[PDB]
Amino acid sequence: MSELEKAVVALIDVFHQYSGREGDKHKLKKSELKELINNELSHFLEEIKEQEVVDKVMETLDSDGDGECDFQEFMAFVAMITTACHEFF
Amino acid sequence: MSELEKAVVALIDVFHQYSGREGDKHKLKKSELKELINNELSHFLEEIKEQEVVDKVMETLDSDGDGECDFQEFMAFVAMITTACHEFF
Ligand SMILES: N=C(N)c1ccc(OCCCCCCCOc2ccc(C(=N)N)cc2)cc1
Ligand SMILES: N=C(N)c1ccc(OCCCCCCCOc2ccc(C(=N)N)cc2)cc1
Ligand SMILES: [Ca+2]
Ligand SMILES: [Ca+2]
Ligand SMILES: [Ca+2]
Ligand SMILES: [Ca+2]
């Protein structure tokens, strides 16, 4: 498989690594999202230590108002992060 | 770096591998998009052999009507592909 194909699989893997920990196994609740950011985006994003910081990230990500981040919402997060990395080149 | 972080970098790398070949170095024209699909998505997508097949993919991807796929439009493509892989689990 190509690097692109392996990357696609990695996006799916990391979502499930975190989404299945608690509650709805197909969505990231705030606690799971905090863990994902702190453990898997430690070189790109500042560590989240306060509940209000994760509340704000979830508010940005949660487009259907259920308080959790589903797979489509996670795709949008990944697009935001990748665009940020891509910029300040 | 985490698998997620490496995946983010791979998305950026593959875009530039193809976007810089011709014309606007920051966008994929149809010919570049065809090469990317055929060479980097050969396990996920059927090979594109006809101009009309790439025309249709570009039509789907091109949200600002310039006939090319920019980085944001490529992000949307990546989201489509990843969602497809994720489904039929
Ligand atoms: N969140 C921040 N403020 C932050 C700033 C810098 C920083 O640096 C270390 C991370 C290194 C990431 C670079 C990996 C991929 O980078 C690129 C590759 C290609 C291109 C490009 N040609 N546009 C741009 C960036 C990390 C976090
Ligand atoms: N385009 C097609 N029709 C097609 C169908 C099957 C096909 O199979 C070979 C590709 C193997 C891809 C699997 C890699 C990642 O897969 C998943 C991982 C986790 C999950 C999940 N738990 N949702 C789903 C899929 C390729 C192309
Ligand atoms: Ca969950
Ligand atoms: Ca939601
Ligand atoms: Ca180009
Ligand atoms: Ca365009």
Residue A82 touches chain B, beta carbons under 8 Å: yes
Phi, psi torsion values for B47, nearest 5 degrees: -55, 135
A13 is in an annotated binding site: no
Distance A66 CA to ligand 4 centre (A): 5
Atom of ligand 2 nearest to the CA of B89: 24
Closest CA to A42 of B8, B11, B9, B1: B1
Domain edges within chain B: 1-89
Q: Please, what is the angle between helix A3-19 and helix A30-40, to 10°?
A: 140
- What is the separation of C-alpha B46 from the centre of its chain, rounded to a whole number of angstroms? 14
Both tokens of B31, joined, read: 């010919």
Q: Is B88 on the interface with A (CB under 8 A)?
A: no
Of the candidates B78, B58, B55, the one whose C-alpha atom is nearest the C-alpha of residue B69 is B58
Method used to determine the 3D structure: X-ray
| Residue found by looking up tokens 């310039």 in the block | B66
Any bridge partners for residue A28, and if so which?
A69
Domain A1-89 top-level CATH class: mainly alpha
Backbone angles phi, psi at A64, to 5 degrees: -110, 10
